[PDB]
Amino acid sequence: VCGETCVGGTCNTPGCTCSWPVCT
Numbered sequence: 001v002c003g004e005t006c007v008g009g010t011c012n013t014p015g016c017t018c019s020w021p022v023c024t
Contacts, residue, residue: 002015002023006019
């Protein structure tokens with residue numbers, strides 16, 4: 001939904017958690 005990846009264990013989108021390669 002955030003269209004972001006957290007492959008580095010990090011998400012820029014605040015209202016988004018992280019599975020691994022995608023910020024939920």
